[PDB]
Design a protein around this ligand. Sequence first.
Ligand SMILES: CCCCCCCC/C=C/CCCCCCCC(=O)OC[C@H](O)CO
Ligand SMILES: CCCCCCCC/C=C/CCCCCCCC(=O)OC[C@H](O)CO
Ligand SMILES: CCCCCCCC/C=C\CCCCCCCC(=O)OC[C@H](O)CO
Ligand SMILES: CCCCCCCC/C=C\CCCCCCCC(=O)OC[C@H](O)CO
Lengths: 156, 155
Amino acid sequence: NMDWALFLTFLAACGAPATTGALLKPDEWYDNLNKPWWNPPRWVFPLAWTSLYFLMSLAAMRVAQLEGSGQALAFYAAQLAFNTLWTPVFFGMKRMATALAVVMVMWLFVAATMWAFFQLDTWAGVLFVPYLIWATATTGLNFEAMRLNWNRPEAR
Amino acid sequence: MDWALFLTFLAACGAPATTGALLKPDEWYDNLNKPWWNPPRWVFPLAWTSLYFLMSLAAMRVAQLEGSGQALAFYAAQLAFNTLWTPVFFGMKRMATALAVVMVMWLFVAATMWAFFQLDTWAGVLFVPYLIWATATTGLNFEAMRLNWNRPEAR
Ligand SMILES: CCCCCCCC/C=C/CCCCCCCC(=O)OC[C@H](O)CO
Ligand SMILES: CCCCCCCC/C=C/CCCCCCCC(=O)OC[C@H](O)CO
Ligand SMILES: CCCCCCCC/C=C\CCCCCCCC(=O)OC[C@H](O)CO
Ligand SMILES: CCCCCCCC/C=C\CCCCCCCC(=O)OC[C@H](O)CO
Protein backbone atom coordinates (compact mmCIF):
# COMPACT_ATOMS: atom_id res chain seq x y z
CA ASN A 1 0.00 0.00 0.00
CA MET A 2 2.29 2.69 1.40
CA ASP A 3 5.54 3.71 -0.32
CA TRP A 4 7.26 6.31 1.88
CA ALA A 5 9.92 7.36 -0.69
CA LEU A 6 7.31 8.33 -3.26
CA PHE A 7 5.09 10.00 -0.70
CA LEU A 8 7.89 12.07 0.83
CA THR A 9 8.93 13.05 -2.70
CA PHE A 10 5.48 14.29 -3.74
CA LEU A 11 5.16 15.97 -0.33
CA ALA A 12 8.50 17.71 -0.83
CA ALA A 13 7.21 18.86 -4.23
CA CYS A 14 4.34 20.63 -2.45
CA GLY A 15 6.99 22.65 -0.68
CA ALA A 16 7.26 24.93 -3.73
CA PRO A 17 3.67 26.12 -3.83
CA ALA A 18 3.62 25.97 -0.02
CA THR A 19 6.49 28.47 -0.14
CA THR A 20 4.60 30.91 -2.38
CA GLY A 21 1.89 31.04 0.27
CA ALA A 22 4.38 31.57 3.06
CA LEU A 23 6.27 34.37 1.30
CA LEU A 24 3.26 36.20 -0.14
CA LYS A 25 0.86 36.84 2.74
CA PRO A 26 -2.39 38.68 2.10
CA ASP A 27 -1.81 42.28 3.27
CA GLU A 28 -3.73 45.58 2.86
CA TRP A 29 -3.98 45.25 -0.94
CA TYR A 30 -5.98 42.06 -0.60
CA ASP A 31 -7.93 43.66 2.28
CA ASN A 32 -9.35 46.57 0.31
CA LEU A 33 -10.43 44.37 -2.62
CA ASN A 34 -14.15 44.04 -3.22
CA LYS A 35 -14.80 40.36 -2.63
CA PRO A 36 -17.85 38.20 -3.18
CA TRP A 37 -20.19 37.38 -0.29
CA TRP A 38 -19.05 33.75 -0.24
CA ASN A 39 -15.38 34.70 0.21
CA PRO A 40 -13.87 32.50 2.94
CA PRO A 41 -11.85 34.19 5.75
CA ARG A 42 -8.05 34.37 5.51
CA TRP A 43 -7.23 31.41 7.73
CA VAL A 44 -9.24 29.06 5.49
CA PHE A 45 -6.73 29.10 2.64
CA PRO A 46 -3.58 27.82 4.45
CA LEU A 47 -5.67 25.08 6.05
CA ALA A 48 -7.23 23.96 2.79
CA TRP A 49 -3.95 23.86 0.86
CA THR A 50 -2.07 22.08 3.63
CA SER A 51 -4.69 19.30 3.59
CA LEU A 52 -4.63 19.05 -0.20
CA TYR A 53 -0.84 18.91 -0.36
CA PHE A 54 -1.09 15.76 1.79
CA LEU A 55 -4.12 14.38 -0.04
CA MET A 56 -2.62 14.77 -3.53
CA SER A 57 0.78 13.37 -2.48
CA LEU A 58 -0.91 10.31 -1.03
CA ALA A 59 -2.87 10.09 -4.26
CA ALA A 60 0.21 10.43 -6.46
CA MET A 61 2.02 7.80 -4.35
CA ARG A 62 -0.65 5.18 -5.08
CA VAL A 63 -0.71 5.92 -8.80
CA ALA A 64 3.07 6.08 -9.22
CA GLN A 65 3.32 2.47 -8.08
CA LEU A 66 1.06 1.27 -10.91
CA GLU A 67 2.15 0.58 -14.47
CA GLY A 68 0.99 2.75 -17.33
CA SER A 69 1.09 5.73 -14.92
CA GLY A 70 3.04 8.10 -17.22
CA GLN A 71 0.29 10.29 -18.67
CA ALA A 72 -1.27 10.62 -15.20
CA LEU A 73 2.01 11.72 -13.61
CA ALA A 74 2.59 14.08 -16.52
CA PHE A 75 -0.81 15.63 -15.76
CA TYR A 76 0.26 15.73 -12.11
CA ALA A 77 3.52 17.58 -12.83
CA ALA A 78 1.55 20.06 -14.93
CA GLN A 79 -1.04 20.72 -12.23
CA LEU A 80 1.62 21.32 -9.57
CA ALA A 81 3.54 23.79 -11.73
CA PHE A 82 0.59 26.08 -12.55
CA ASN A 83 -0.39 25.85 -8.90
CA THR A 84 3.08 27.08 -7.93
CA LEU A 85 2.62 29.92 -10.47
CA TRP A 86 -0.78 31.23 -9.33
CA THR A 87 0.08 32.89 -5.97
CA PRO A 88 3.07 34.83 -7.26
CA VAL A 89 0.86 36.12 -10.03
CA PHE A 90 -2.20 37.04 -7.95
CA PHE A 91 -0.46 38.32 -4.81
CA GLY A 92 3.06 38.88 -6.10
CA MET A 93 2.69 40.68 -9.42
CA LYS A 94 -0.92 41.53 -8.52
CA ARG A 95 -2.37 40.79 -11.94
CA MET A 96 -5.82 39.36 -11.25
CA ALA A 97 -6.82 38.87 -14.91
CA THR A 98 -3.57 37.08 -15.69
CA ALA A 99 -3.88 35.00 -12.50
CA LEU A 100 -7.30 33.98 -13.73
CA ALA A 101 -5.73 32.63 -16.91
CA VAL A 102 -3.28 30.71 -14.74
CA VAL A 103 -5.89 29.28 -12.36
CA MET A 104 -8.14 28.13 -15.20
CA VAL A 105 -5.23 26.20 -16.77
CA MET A 106 -4.50 24.88 -13.29
CA TRP A 107 -8.11 23.70 -13.23
CA LEU A 108 -7.85 21.81 -16.54
CA PHE A 109 -4.77 19.96 -15.39
CA VAL A 110 -6.27 19.24 -11.96
CA ALA A 111 -9.23 17.73 -13.83
CA ALA A 112 -7.10 15.83 -16.32
CA THR A 113 -5.18 14.40 -13.36
CA MET A 114 -8.32 13.36 -11.50
CA TRP A 115 -9.59 11.53 -14.58
CA ALA A 116 -6.28 9.83 -15.37
CA PHE A 117 -6.04 8.94 -11.67
CA PHE A 118 -9.52 7.36 -11.68
CA GLN A 119 -8.66 5.23 -14.70
CA LEU A 120 -5.76 3.61 -12.79
CA ASP A 121 -6.89 3.63 -9.14
CA THR A 122 -10.32 4.68 -7.83
CA TRP A 123 -9.04 5.86 -4.41
CA ALA A 124 -6.43 8.08 -6.09
CA GLY A 125 -9.10 9.75 -8.18
CA VAL A 126 -11.22 9.94 -5.05
CA LEU A 127 -8.35 11.71 -3.29
CA PHE A 128 -8.33 14.37 -6.02
CA VAL A 129 -12.08 15.10 -5.84
CA PRO A 130 -11.79 17.62 -2.98
CA TYR A 131 -8.89 19.14 -4.95
CA LEU A 132 -11.16 19.74 -7.95
CA ILE A 133 -13.84 21.32 -5.78
CA TRP A 134 -11.40 23.76 -4.12
CA ALA A 135 -9.85 24.59 -7.52
CA THR A 136 -13.29 25.50 -8.86
CA ALA A 137 -14.07 27.66 -5.84
CA THR A 138 -10.69 29.38 -6.23
CA THR A 139 -11.34 30.01 -9.91
CA GLY A 140 -14.72 31.49 -9.06
CA LEU A 141 -13.06 33.60 -6.39
CA ASN A 142 -10.34 34.69 -8.81
CA PHE A 143 -13.05 35.49 -11.29
CA GLU A 144 -15.08 37.65 -8.88
CA ALA A 145 -11.89 39.34 -7.73
CA MET A 146 -11.18 40.32 -11.33
CA ARG A 147 -14.70 41.44 -12.21
CA LEU A 148 -15.72 43.21 -8.95
CA ASN A 149 -12.46 45.17 -9.06
CA TRP A 150 -12.19 45.65 -12.80
CA ASN A 151 -11.55 49.39 -12.69
CA ARG A 152 -8.43 49.09 -10.51
CA PRO A 153 -5.07 48.73 -12.21
CA GLU A 154 -4.37 45.30 -10.67
CA ALA A 155 -7.06 43.81 -12.88
CA ARG A 156 -4.76 42.99 -15.82
CA MET B 1 8.36 9.29 -29.76
CA ASP B 2 5.04 9.73 -27.83
CA TRP B 3 3.34 12.99 -28.74
CA ALA B 4 0.64 12.98 -26.07
CA LEU B 5 3.29 12.67 -23.36
CA PHE B 6 5.69 15.16 -24.87
CA LEU B 7 3.13 17.90 -25.29
CA THR B 8 1.85 17.40 -21.75
CA PHE B 9 5.35 17.98 -20.35
CA LEU B 10 5.99 20.87 -22.69
CA ALA B 11 2.69 22.44 -21.54
CA ALA B 12 3.83 21.96 -17.92
CA CYS B 13 6.89 24.01 -18.88
CA GLY B 14 4.44 26.80 -19.72
CA ALA B 15 4.18 27.57 -15.99
CA PRO B 16 7.86 28.46 -15.43
CA ALA B 17 8.05 30.08 -18.88
CA THR B 18 5.16 32.42 -17.97
CA THR B 19 7.10 33.63 -14.90
CA GLY B 20 9.95 34.75 -17.15
CA ALA B 21 7.93 36.41 -19.90
CA LEU B 22 6.02 38.37 -17.22
CA LEU B 23 9.04 39.38 -15.15
CA LYS B 24 11.33 40.73 -17.87
CA PRO B 25 14.64 42.17 -16.51
CA ASP B 26 14.23 45.98 -16.35
CA GLU B 27 16.01 48.81 -14.50
CA TRP B 28 16.27 46.87 -11.24
CA TYR B 29 18.15 43.97 -12.77
CA ASP B 30 20.26 46.48 -14.70
CA ASN B 31 21.28 48.29 -11.50
CA LEU B 32 21.89 45.13 -9.50
CA ASN B 33 25.53 44.30 -8.74
CA LYS B 34 26.62 41.37 -10.91
CA PRO B 35 29.76 39.27 -11.57
CA TRP B 36 31.86 39.95 -14.67
CA TRP B 37 30.83 36.61 -16.10
CA ASN B 38 27.13 37.46 -16.05
CA PRO B 39 25.80 36.76 -19.57
CA PRO B 40 23.80 39.24 -21.66
CA ARG B 41 20.10 39.13 -20.83
CA TRP B 42 19.20 37.59 -24.23
CA VAL B 43 20.97 34.33 -23.28
CA PHE B 44 18.41 33.53 -20.53
CA PRO B 45 15.31 33.03 -22.72
CA LEU B 46 17.35 31.03 -25.23
CA ALA B 47 18.77 28.69 -22.62
CA TRP B 48 15.49 28.02 -20.81
CA THR B 49 13.45 27.53 -23.96
CA SER B 50 16.02 24.96 -25.09
CA LEU B 51 15.89 23.23 -21.71
CA TYR B 52 12.07 23.15 -21.67
CA PHE B 53 12.21 21.16 -24.90
CA LEU B 54 15.10 18.98 -23.75
CA MET B 55 13.56 18.24 -20.31
CA SER B 56 10.19 17.43 -21.88
CA LEU B 57 11.69 15.02 -24.40
CA ALA B 58 13.53 13.38 -21.52
CA ALA B 59 10.32 13.14 -19.49
CA MET B 60 8.48 11.61 -22.50
CA ARG B 61 11.04 8.79 -22.76
CA VAL B 62 11.07 7.99 -19.06
CA ALA B 63 7.26 8.07 -18.66
CA GLN B 64 6.87 5.33 -21.27
CA LEU B 65 8.71 2.82 -19.03
CA GLU B 66 7.68 0.49 -16.24
CA GLY B 67 9.01 1.64 -12.84
CA SER B 68 9.13 5.38 -13.67
CA GLY B 69 7.08 6.56 -10.65
CA GLN B 70 9.95 7.81 -8.46
CA ALA B 71 11.70 9.39 -11.45
CA LEU B 72 8.56 11.29 -12.38
CA ALA B 73 8.08 12.37 -8.77
CA PHE B 74 11.53 13.92 -8.87
CA TYR B 75 10.54 15.58 -12.13
CA ALA B 76 7.38 17.14 -10.68
CA ALA B 77 9.50 18.40 -7.75
CA GLN B 78 12.26 20.03 -9.82
CA LEU B 79 9.66 21.58 -12.12
CA ALA B 80 7.84 23.11 -9.17
CA PHE B 81 10.92 24.68 -7.60
CA ASN B 82 11.98 25.85 -11.04
CA THR B 83 8.69 27.69 -11.26
CA LEU B 84 9.08 29.12 -7.74
CA TRP B 85 12.56 30.55 -8.39
CA THR B 86 12.03 33.37 -10.96
CA PRO B 87 9.20 34.96 -8.99
CA VAL B 88 11.38 34.87 -5.84
CA PHE B 89 14.48 36.27 -7.56
CA PHE B 90 12.95 38.83 -9.94
CA GLY B 91 9.53 39.54 -8.50
CA MET B 92 10.04 39.58 -4.74
CA LYS B 93 13.72 40.42 -5.40
CA ARG B 94 14.84 38.37 -2.39
CA MET B 95 18.35 37.22 -3.12
CA ALA B 96 19.03 34.87 -0.19
CA THR B 97 15.62 33.19 -0.31
CA ALA B 98 16.22 32.80 -4.05
CA LEU B 99 19.52 31.04 -3.32
CA ALA B 100 17.69 28.58 -1.05
CA VAL B 101 15.08 27.87 -3.72
CA VAL B 102 17.61 27.40 -6.51
CA MET B 103 19.69 25.04 -4.33
CA VAL B 104 16.58 22.90 -3.75
CA MET B 105 15.89 23.04 -7.49
CA TRP B 106 19.44 21.88 -8.23
CA LEU B 107 19.06 18.92 -5.85
CA PHE B 108 15.85 17.74 -7.50
CA VAL B 109 17.32 18.37 -10.96
CA ALA B 110 20.23 16.13 -9.99
CA ALA B 111 17.92 13.47 -8.47
CA THR B 112 15.79 13.53 -11.60
CA MET B 113 18.87 13.17 -13.85
CA TRP B 114 20.03 10.38 -11.60
CA ALA B 115 16.71 8.52 -11.65
CA PHE B 116 16.49 9.10 -15.39
CA PHE B 117 19.83 7.32 -15.92
CA GLN B 118 18.56 4.29 -13.97
CA LEU B 119 15.84 3.78 -16.59
CA ASP B 120 16.86 5.45 -19.88
CA THR B 121 20.41 6.61 -20.66
CA TRP B 122 19.43 9.18 -23.26
CA ALA B 123 16.85 10.62 -20.86
CA GLY B 124 19.74 11.08 -18.39
CA VAL B 125 21.98 12.64 -21.05
CA LEU B 126 19.24 15.12 -21.91
CA PHE B 127 19.21 16.30 -18.27
CA VAL B 128 22.93 17.00 -18.27
CA PRO B 129 22.81 20.50 -19.81
CA TYR B 130 19.88 21.31 -17.52
CA LEU B 131 22.13 20.41 -14.56
CA ILE B 132 25.09 22.36 -15.89
CA TRP B 133 22.81 25.36 -16.33
CA ALA B 134 21.23 24.93 -12.86
CA THR B 135 24.74 24.94 -11.43
CA ALA B 136 25.61 28.18 -13.19
CA THR B 137 22.34 29.74 -12.07
CA THR B 138 23.17 28.77 -8.49
CA GLY B 139 26.57 30.40 -8.93
CA LEU B 140 25.03 33.51 -10.46
CA ASN B 141 22.47 33.62 -7.64
CA PHE B 142 25.14 33.13 -5.01
CA GLU B 143 27.29 35.93 -6.50
CA ALA B 144 24.41 38.39 -6.80
CA MET B 145 23.57 37.63 -3.17
CA ARG B 146 27.03 38.48 -1.85
CA LEU B 147 27.60 41.44 -4.17
CA ASN B 148 24.34 42.97 -2.99
CA TRP B 149 24.64 41.77 0.56
CA ASN B 150 24.49 45.29 1.97
CA ARG B 151 21.32 46.21 0.00
CA PRO B 152 17.66 45.41 0.88
CA GLU B 153 17.71 42.44 -1.49
CA ALA B 154 19.75 40.41 1.04
CA ARG B 155 16.41 39.00 2.23
C1 LIG C 1 -0.90 22.28 -25.69
C2 LIG C 1 0.47 22.91 -25.57
C3 LIG C 1 1.56 21.88 -25.83
C4 LIG C 1 2.95 22.46 -25.61
C5 LIG C 1 3.21 23.65 -26.52
C6 LIG C 1 3.25 24.93 -25.70
C7 LIG C 1 4.39 24.82 -24.71
C8 LIG C 1 4.34 25.92 -23.67
C9 LIG C 1 5.76 26.18 -23.20
C10 LIG C 1 6.81 25.79 -23.96
C11 LIG C 1 8.20 26.33 -23.70
C12 LIG C 1 8.73 27.05 -24.92
C13 LIG C 1 9.58 28.23 -24.47
C14 LIG C 1 8.74 29.47 -24.19
C15 LIG C 1 9.64 30.69 -24.17
C16 LIG C 1 10.20 30.93 -22.78
C17 LIG C 1 11.11 32.14 -22.74
C18 LIG C 1 11.22 32.70 -21.33
O1 LIG C 1 11.19 33.91 -21.16
O2 LIG C 1 11.66 31.88 -20.28
C19 LIG C 1 11.80 32.54 -19.05
C20 LIG C 1 12.59 31.65 -18.11
O3 LIG C 1 12.39 30.32 -18.51
C21 LIG C 1 12.12 31.77 -16.67
O4 LIG C 1 13.06 31.13 -15.83
C1 LIG D 1 15.31 33.53 -16.26
C2 LIG D 1 16.82 33.46 -16.37
C3 LIG D 1 17.40 32.76 -15.15
C4 LIG D 1 18.75 32.12 -15.46
C5 LIG D 1 19.79 33.20 -15.33
C6 LIG D 1 20.92 32.71 -14.45
C7 LIG D 1 21.87 31.85 -15.27
C8 LIG D 1 22.90 32.71 -15.97
C9 LIG D 1 24.29 32.14 -15.75
C10 LIG D 1 25.06 31.79 -16.81
C11 LIG D 1 26.58 31.89 -16.76
C12 LIG D 1 27.18 31.81 -18.16
C13 LIG D 1 28.65 31.48 -18.08
C14 LIG D 1 29.49 32.67 -18.52
C15 LIG D 1 29.33 32.89 -20.01
C16 LIG D 1 30.53 33.59 -20.62
C17 LIG D 1 30.80 34.94 -19.97
C18 LIG D 1 29.93 36.02 -20.57
O1 LIG D 1 28.72 35.90 -20.48
O2 LIG D 1 30.49 37.29 -20.86
C19 LIG D 1 29.55 38.25 -21.32
C20 LIG D 1 30.17 39.21 -22.32
O3 LIG D 1 31.08 40.07 -21.67
C21 LIG D 1 29.10 40.04 -22.99
O4 LIG D 1 29.05 39.77 -24.37
C1 LIG E 1 12.92 12.68 -0.28
C2 LIG E 1 12.30 14.04 0.04
C3 LIG E 1 11.88 14.12 1.50
C4 LIG E 1 11.51 15.54 1.91
C5 LIG E 1 10.93 15.59 3.32
C6 LIG E 1 9.50 16.10 3.35
C7 LIG E 1 9.44 17.60 3.24
C8 LIG E 1 7.99 18.03 3.03
C9 LIG E 1 7.88 19.54 3.09
C10 LIG E 1 6.77 20.20 2.67
C11 LIG E 1 5.41 19.89 3.27
C12 LIG E 1 4.35 20.72 2.57
C13 LIG E 1 3.04 20.63 3.32
C14 LIG E 1 2.42 22.02 3.41
C15 LIG E 1 2.84 22.73 4.68
C16 LIG E 1 2.59 24.23 4.63
C17 LIG E 1 1.43 24.58 3.71
C18 LIG E 1 1.38 26.08 3.42
O1 LIG E 1 1.88 26.85 4.22
O2 LIG E 1 0.94 26.55 2.16
C19 LIG E 1 -0.29 27.27 2.12
C20 LIG E 1 -0.25 28.32 1.02
O3 LIG E 1 -1.04 29.45 1.37
C21 LIG E 1 -0.72 27.77 -0.31
O4 LIG E 1 -0.34 28.63 -1.38
C1 LIG F 1 16.57 17.11 -2.09
C2 LIG F 1 15.91 17.29 -0.74
C3 LIG F 1 15.04 18.53 -0.75
C4 LIG F 1 13.92 18.40 0.27
C5 LIG F 1 13.40 19.77 0.65
C6 LIG F 1 14.57 20.60 1.15
C7 LIG F 1 14.36 21.08 2.58
C8 LIG F 1 15.65 21.72 3.08
C9 LIG F 1 15.59 21.89 4.58
C10 LIG F 1 15.83 23.10 5.13
C11 LIG F 1 16.09 24.30 4.22
C12 LIG F 1 16.37 25.54 5.05
C13 LIG F 1 17.09 26.57 4.21
C14 LIG F 1 16.68 27.95 4.69
C15 LIG F 1 17.32 29.02 3.83
C16 LIG F 1 17.36 30.35 4.57
C17 LIG F 1 16.26 31.30 4.13
C18 LIG F 1 16.73 32.75 4.20
O1 LIG F 1 16.94 33.34 3.16
O2 LIG F 1 16.44 33.52 5.34
C19 LIG F 1 16.58 34.92 5.20
C20 LIG F 1 15.28 35.58 5.61
O3 LIG F 1 15.05 36.74 4.85
C21 LIG F 1 15.30 36.01 7.06
O4 LIG F 1 14.64 37.26 7.12
